Ligand binder design. Structure first.
Ligand SMILES: Nc1nc2c(ncn2[C@@H]2O[C@H](COP(=O)(O)OP(=O)(O)O)[C@@H](O)[C@H]2O)c(=O)[nH]1
Ligand SMILES: [Mg+2]
Length: 166
């Protein structure tokens, strides 16, 4: 048996979802998915990353839901609750407050940020401690770090599903 982890990325148009996926998988910057084999501690896993109705089953199979906003656009941060709630509604996870979400505040390379780090960290903390990363898909800042945690938390979820045949 091999270990396949499904990860989906949500967030407003233009925040950097496609760029983050490409930077992570291909280290290049410029309904579908890319795949990458990653080691989690000493366990090899294949992450299948899906870029964004798509239908309920699309969401139901996910092991981690990544939420992305643009630190220079307060409106994309404001929609995070809607993206989180919509994923919950579509995926119907059995332990909503523990399902793995990872939030990425992207484009930190643009010095005139409009959303404060503390504000975004507080939002994440208040949803049962969702992990938070500030990234730059353009300059490859914290992208490997963010996705390593996405991989580890998706593995935890996938393990839970497999061990209790959920
Ligand atoms: N400065 C900067 N621009 C970025 C970054 N990530 C993406 N972009 C740019 O912002 C636009 C939208 O990015 P795109 O990846 O297509 O995001 P999507 O619509 O969420 O999938 C494009 O012009 C990208 O080149 C980043 O980290 N920094
Ligand atoms: Mg896109």
């Amino acid at each position: 048996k091999k270990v396949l982890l499904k990860v989906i990325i949500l967030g407003d148009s233009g925040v950097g979802k496609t760029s983050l996926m490409n930077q992570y998988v291909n280290k290049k910057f410029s309904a579908d998915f890319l795949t990458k084999e990653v080691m989690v501690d000493d366990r090899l896993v294949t992450m299948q990353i899906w870029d964004t109705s798509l239908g309920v089953a699309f969401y139901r199979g996910a092991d981690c839901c990544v939420l992305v906003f643009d630190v220079t656009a307060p409106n994309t941060f404001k929609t995070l609750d809607s993206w989180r709630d919509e994923f919950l509604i579509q995926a119907s996870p059995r332990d909503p407050e523990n399902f793995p979400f990872v939030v990425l505040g992207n484009k930190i390379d643009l010095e005139n940020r409009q959303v404060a780090t503390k504000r975004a960290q507080a939002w994440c903390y208040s949803k049962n401690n969702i992990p938070y990363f500030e990234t730059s898909a353009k300059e490859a800042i914290n992208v490997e770090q963010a996705f390593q945690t996405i991989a580890r938390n998706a593995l935890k979820q996938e393990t839970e599903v497999e061990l209790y045949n959920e």
